[PDB]
Design a protein around this ligand. Structure first.
Ligand SMILES: OC[C@H]1O[C@@H](n2cnc3c2N=CNC[C@H]3O)C[C@@H]1O
Ligand SMILES: [Zn+2]
Length: 359
């Protein structure tokens, strides 16, 4: 046996969630064999870990643990994706050296294991990690790959972890072209390519994305998240120009039947991040989060944590929110995790292994 007795499809009907306290519900969420596709490793940490980094490098000697969390992180939320990014830029204070990056990666993988994630596609931005202390992106990648490997080996491969590379916008020394080049140079370690930060129309980088995609690295980019944009052009470009297999967030697809139809017919999956959307004010509330209408419309969706570090949450919190506020069932969650598995960028023989073991 292993620490977590994962739920089987047959057992789901015997579990009455309505009887359970929040504490007892989280024991059930933990036992869901989760496939997570959208989580930023470089912003994936616990409160305790973050504060330890701040103390290690004596960054905020005049602030208490709690003041440090309020100063740097996004647990209470904010106004926008713009405000989220400026706060992420502050968090880059911890990227002091390659030792802390390895430790970050190690703890990130281990916590996902503890939470009951069986398939983990992590993503990180080389330029985002490098800029604050002018680090070497080759050495950053080395530290990350090493940290993941060491923990995965310790855990006897009971969690399967893959990496995506993020080109991004909205921080100093950001470079999409260079990020794409780095991704292809390290194609053996990267299973996909993403764009994050500020949400922009990626039509203007058609050539860079064509080149990455056509080289055999599938695309999943952030689009249809930011509700402050005056139209849905970013989604049309993501789908029709970038030819993405998956969309980060994509919650604004719900505002257009045309996009709903296109996404369904192209077998595109939306990587929904419930808590993230609410905290960035991209959903008005969890009660009115678009995932419910998207799910009912027949669009493929999966549940993701996005940034455990920024929000001081974990993947099981997102499951809790969908159950409590939007009446999602264990059967829904199993279905969505199976979609996530089907749409994952991991090697298919690994995916077949995970399917036989849990689904
Ligand atoms: O991995 C770090 C990079 O990714 C961005 N990033 C991190 N989390 C998100 C990001 N981007 C867009 N929207 C909210 C959420 O999905 C920040 C940085 O550039
Ligand atoms: Zn994201």
């Amino acid at each position: 046996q292993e620490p977590i007795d994962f739920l089987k499809k047959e057992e789901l009907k015997n579990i009455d969630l309505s009887q359970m306290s929040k504490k007892e519900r989280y024991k059930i969420w933990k036992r869901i064999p989760k496939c997570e596709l959208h989580c930023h490793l470089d912003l994936c940490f616990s409160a305790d870990f973050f504060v330890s980094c701040i103390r290690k490098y004596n960054l905020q000697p005049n602030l208490s643990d709690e003041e440090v969390l309020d100063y740097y992180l996004f647990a209470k939320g904010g106004k926008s994706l713009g405000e989220f990014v400026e706060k992420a830029i502050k968090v880059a204070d911890i990227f002091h050296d390659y030792e802390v990056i390895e430790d970050l990666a190690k703890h990130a993988v281990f916590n996902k294991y503890k939470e009951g994630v069986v398939l983990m596609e992590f993503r990180y931005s080389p330029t985002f990690v490098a800029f604050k202390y002018n680090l070497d992106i080759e050495l950053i990648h080395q530290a990350i790959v090493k940290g993941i490997k060491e923990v995965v080996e310790l855990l006897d491969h009971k969690i399967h972890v893959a990496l995506m590379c993020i080109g991004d916008t909205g921080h100093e020394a950001a470079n999409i072209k260079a990020s794409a080049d780095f991704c292809l140079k390290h194609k053996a370690d990267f299973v996909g390519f993403d764009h994050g930060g500020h949400e922009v129309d990626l039509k203007e980088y058609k050539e860079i994305f064509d080149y990455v995609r056509e080289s055999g690295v599938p695309l999943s980019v952030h689009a249809g998240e930011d509700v402050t944009l005056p139209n849905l052009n970013t989604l049309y470009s993501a789908i029709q120009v970038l030819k993405v297999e998956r969309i980060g967030h994509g919650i604004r697809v719900a505002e257009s039947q045309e996009l709903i139809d296109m996404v369904k017919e192209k077998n595109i999956l939306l990587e929904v991040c419930p808590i993230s959307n609410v905290l960035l004010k991209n959903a008005k509330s969890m009660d009115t989060h678009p995932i419910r209408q998207l799910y009912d419309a027949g669009v493929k969706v999966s549940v993701n944590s996005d940034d455990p570090g920024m929000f001081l949450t974990n993947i099981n919190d997102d499951y809790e929110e969908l159950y409590t506020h939007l009446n999602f069932t264990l059967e829904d969650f199993m279905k969505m995790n199976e979609w996530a598995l089907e749409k994952s960028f991991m090697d298919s023989n690994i995916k077949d292994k995970i399917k036989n073991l849990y689904f």
